[PDB]
Amino acid sequence: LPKFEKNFYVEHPEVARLTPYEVDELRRKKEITVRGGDVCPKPVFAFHHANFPQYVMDVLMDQHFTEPTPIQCQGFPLALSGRDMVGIAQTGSGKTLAYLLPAIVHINHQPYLERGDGPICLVLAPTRELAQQVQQVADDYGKCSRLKSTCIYGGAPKGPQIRDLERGVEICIATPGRLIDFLESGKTNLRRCTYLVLDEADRMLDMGFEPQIRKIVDQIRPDRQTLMWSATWPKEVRQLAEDFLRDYTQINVGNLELSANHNILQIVDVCMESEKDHKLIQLMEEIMAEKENKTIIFVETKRRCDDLTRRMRRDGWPAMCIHGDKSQPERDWVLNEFRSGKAPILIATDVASRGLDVEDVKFVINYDYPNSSEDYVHRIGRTARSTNKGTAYTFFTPGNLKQARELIKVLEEANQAINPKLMQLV
RNA sequence: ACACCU
Ligand SMILES: Nc1ncnc2c1ncn2[C@@H]1O[C@H](COP(=O)(O)OP(=O)(O)O)[C@@H](O)[C@H]1O
Ligand code: BEF
Ligand SMILES: [Mg+2]
Numbered sequence: 001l002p003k004f005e006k007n008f009y010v011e012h013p014e015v016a017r018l019t020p021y022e023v024d025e026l027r028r029k030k031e032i033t034v035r036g037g038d039v040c041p042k043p044v045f046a047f048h049h050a051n052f053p054q055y056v057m058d059v060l061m062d063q064h065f066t067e068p069t070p071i072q073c074q075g076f077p078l079a080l081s082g083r084d085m086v087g088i089a090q091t092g093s094g095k096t097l098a099y100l101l102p103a104i105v106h107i108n109h110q111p112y113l114e115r116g117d118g119p120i121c122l123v124l125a126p127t128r129e130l131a132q133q134v135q136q137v138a139d140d141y142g143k144c145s146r147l148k149s150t151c152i153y154g155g156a157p158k159g160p161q162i163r164d165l166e167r168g169v170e171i172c173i174a175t176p177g178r179l180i181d182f183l184e185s186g187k188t189n190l191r192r193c194t195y196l197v198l199d200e201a202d203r204m205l206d207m208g209f210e211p212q213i214r215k216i217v218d219q220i221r222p223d224r225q226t227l228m229w230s231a232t233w234p235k236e237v238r239q240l241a242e243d244f245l246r247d248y249t250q251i252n253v254g255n256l257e258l259s260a261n262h263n264i265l266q267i268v269d270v271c272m273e274s275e276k277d278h279k280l281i282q283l284m285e286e287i288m289a290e291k292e293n294k295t296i297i298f299v300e301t302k303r304r305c306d307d308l309t310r311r312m313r314r315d316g317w318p319a320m321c322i323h324g325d326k327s328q329p330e331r332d333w334v335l336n337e338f339r340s341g342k343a344p345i346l347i348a349t350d351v352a353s354r355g356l357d358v359e360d361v362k363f364v365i366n367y368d369y370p371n372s373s374e375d376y377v378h379r380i381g382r383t384a385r386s387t388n389k390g391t392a393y394t395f396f397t398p399g400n401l402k403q404a405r406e407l408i409k410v411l412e413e414a415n416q417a418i419n420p421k422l423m424q425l426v
Numbered sequence: 427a428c429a430c431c432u
Contacts (some may be wrong), residue, residue: 063431126429177431185430208429303427324429350428371427 004194004223005109006082008249012049015042015077030070031254038249041077041078044068051105066258069094070253076102084226084248086201086241088233090261091381092357092388093253095229099123099197100138102169105169106225108145118165118189119172121179122220123197124213126204127336128153128175128328129178130355134199136172142171152188154178162187176204176212190220198244200354201228202374205237210269212393217244231259231381231387232374258406259413260377263365265391270421273397276367277311283365283393284317288344292362298379305358308367309347319345322352361385366394373406401425 016028027034034040044050047060058092068076071089078085079102089095103121110120123138125131131303135151135231142149150164150170157351161178165188172179172188174192197219198204202215217226224298226245233252242248260266271279280297287293299403302323309321320343331351337343353375360385370376376394383390396407404425411418 128430158431175430179431181431205430206429212430353428374429 001222001419002111002192008051008105008109009041009077009080010051011077011081012044014046015044015049018042020324027074028424031071032070033252033256034074035250035252038077039083040074040249040251041081043074043075044077050101051080052362053104053145054183055109056104056141057099059141059144069098071095072098074251074253075099078251079103079225079227080105082225084244084245085248086228086233086248088230088251089253090259091378092261092385094386095199095231096134096357097136097141099199099227099229100134100141103138103195103197104142104145104147107147108378110192110194113168113170113176113192115168116189117192120173120192121195121197122190122193122201122251123171123173123214124179125173125199126177126209127351128155129174129322129331129352130200131173133355133357134334134336135229136138136169138171138173139222147171149173152179152182155331157174158182158187161402168417176209180215183216190216192236193220194224195225196220196226198226198228199230201230201241202232202237203230203232203354205240210240213244222246232377234258234374238385250406253412257413258373258377258410261381261384262414263387263389264380265389266373266380266414266416267408268394268396268411268422269390270396270419270420270425273399276315276395279395281366281368284345287363290362292360293363294338294341294358295346295363295365296352296361296379296382297345297365297367298353298370299347299349300370302349304368305347305349312345312347317345318343319347321347322397323349324351350375350379352382356382357385358366362390364390364392366392369394369396369400369407371401373403374411375408376407398425
């Protein structure tokens, strides 16, 4: 087993000199909470504290990044220290670079990939488009250290993915099913995997994904570092997560309860199911009169996604849809059209609810309320990325009554006005 | 339900 160098974080003197109270005040200013009893390095507060290669710093400055986000301030040094961790922070607040840039430093301290060598960093994600997005970010920065990456996911030909794995990648981004296929058939292996990331980790630990995660992680060396990330960390996944963690540290940004990004204006319209169509058209007529009008509309099922899109297109709306019954080339094409703005309206199932970072989305519409309050927080987080603001509009019916209590709590935490009809439902 | 190999 090639030796795993784990001790390479060098704390900057500007960070090391802070006293414990000063650290607590820095965390307070950034709304960082570290779970009690965990060992945790002091947070950094500038990119030059974070041990990054000069070429990574060059790329960061070229993209006009000036200061790490809160989850980066605490997550960079925790990840760099080699500790297992859980990092929870709001949608759009920079979790991807929080785990990718320490991955690059980690990789740079390991022996070079030989032949027959699988990846050093493995990132798991719940959807194919999110895996592709993370790989694009990783390539942007991994190229600085001459690192190779690939994306392993279903619906695309196996051959090119097998080629990339056999050529050698230090960084592999994957959805679980196709990776399991390749592990079972010997197209890659996890004997060099020492940095394992579960992005959208609470989703990856849910009823459908947890057995896939378990099958994968059972094949990885137990001396690996494991890093889990999400905007939501409900109690239900916390004990289960310990099956995949060893001596770990949990960090949070924002309130400890379930919380949305506070840059989102959250509007809830309480209505009957039969009123949704008319109300949607009214809303879209106002949205499409604006200059910045890029909109995602979420629905509950693939069938409703197809039906709503056809209904909208039949009336001349420039809408396209994405869901799991489309071919992967269709899914890729639609999302690229949405990113470019050639199609300003995307209608989607929860396939598009997590992780996707489309810069100029201004509106998220919950045509159907989702199955959980966590799903609501992720969906509305497709707007208000980075420092941007955005608006979410939700249609909430009496059929959704069971979800009302938790929705009210999310609205209250974000200091949003609560529709009296929603209150009257409880 | 929604994702997630074939
Ligand atoms: N330190 C930073 N300053 C400004 N923008 C950033 C910074 N870090 C990341 N971003 C940008 O913020 C956006 C959201 O990042 P992302 O990693 O997708 O969020 P999350 O995973 O937390 O939902 C991305 O476009 C990313 O380039
Ligand atoms: F939480 Be980010 F939207 F992935
Ligand atoms: Mg993310």
